[PDB]
């Protein structure tokens, strides 16, 4: 895994029509991985590769990376909120949150088999609750099921 | 003075669509994370985040399940993203050098 740098010229010709994104670090990133359950939730085999891959990727993209592993619903809520409230956000230009677990439409599972609603997660980082990120790009990546229906795929005509 | 909506300037990438399962290889990890890392590391230098998520969508659409003797054999998945972004989001990696 290697991240090709942007050229000075590409920066010069794109910065005026883009979010400001030049702080060092670019932002804080949070990688929250749930792999071991028990509370119908199978061990997330290979979940360890996802976590390591994202940690490396976000570091190479110039983020300061925070990691959390195997957390209950309530722990995720409290720690997401702690993260959102960190003082660094005022001096960074963006934020990244990646959530990797089992889930259902609109919510993800803690290792205790209880659910954290994604609406509540986004709310932690909104304009009213996270003023230090107002007008700054906030990226969320959610690796989790949104239902139990397998997509069998369809033939192409 | 200009005020803000309660929520804006977010982009959320989802591994799968509403009602459906996201797929994960027991050795190689999640299709969506694997694709995301390959595209971002290759294209963050010259492509904005929303456009990179479109490239991720292309990779996911093309993939199919390998899990012989089970309901996941040849299965499919589609990723998506939802955006309240108000500008291009370039990560400008390694700038300044």
């Amino acid at each position: 895994m290697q991240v090709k740098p942007c050229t000075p010229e590409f920066y010069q010709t794109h910065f005026q029509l883009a979010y400001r994104l030049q702080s060092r670090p670019r932002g804080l990133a949070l990688v929250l991985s749930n792999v071991h359950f028990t509370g119908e939730l199978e061990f997330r085999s290979g979940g360890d590769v996802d976590h390591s891959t994202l940690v490396t990727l976000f570091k190479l993209l110039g983020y300061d990376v925070h990691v959390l592993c195997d957390q209950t619903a309530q722990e995720m809520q409290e720690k997401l909120q702690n993260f959102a409230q960190l003082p660094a956000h005022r001096v960074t230009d963006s934020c990244i949150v990646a959530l990797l677990s089992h889930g259902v439409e609109g919510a993800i599972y803690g290792v205790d088999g209880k659910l954290l609603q994604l609406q509540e997660v986004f709310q932690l980082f909104d304009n009213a609750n996270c003023p230090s990120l107002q007008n700054k790009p906030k990226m969320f990546f959610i690796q989790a099921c949104r239902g139990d229906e397998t997509d069998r795929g369809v033939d192409q005509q | 003075k200009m005020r803000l909506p309660t929520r804006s300037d977010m982009i959320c990438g989802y591994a799968c669509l509403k009602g459906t399962a996201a797929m994960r290889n027991t050795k190689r990890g999640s299709w969506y994370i694997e694709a995301l890392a390959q595209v971002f590391s290759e294209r963050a230098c010259d492509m904005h985040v929303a456009d990179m998520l479109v490239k991720v969508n292309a990779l996911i659409k093309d993939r199919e399940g390998y899990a012989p003797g089970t309901e996941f054999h040849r299965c499919k998945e589609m990723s998506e993203y939802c955006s309240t972004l108000c500008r291009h989001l370039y990560l400008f990696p390694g700038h300044p050098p």
Binding site: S45, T150 | A21, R24, T26, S30, W31, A67, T70, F72
Partner: peptide, 5 residues
């Protein structure tokens, strides 16, 4: 092998 999240 491929499995569901």
């Amino acid at each position: 092998v491929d499995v569901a999240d």
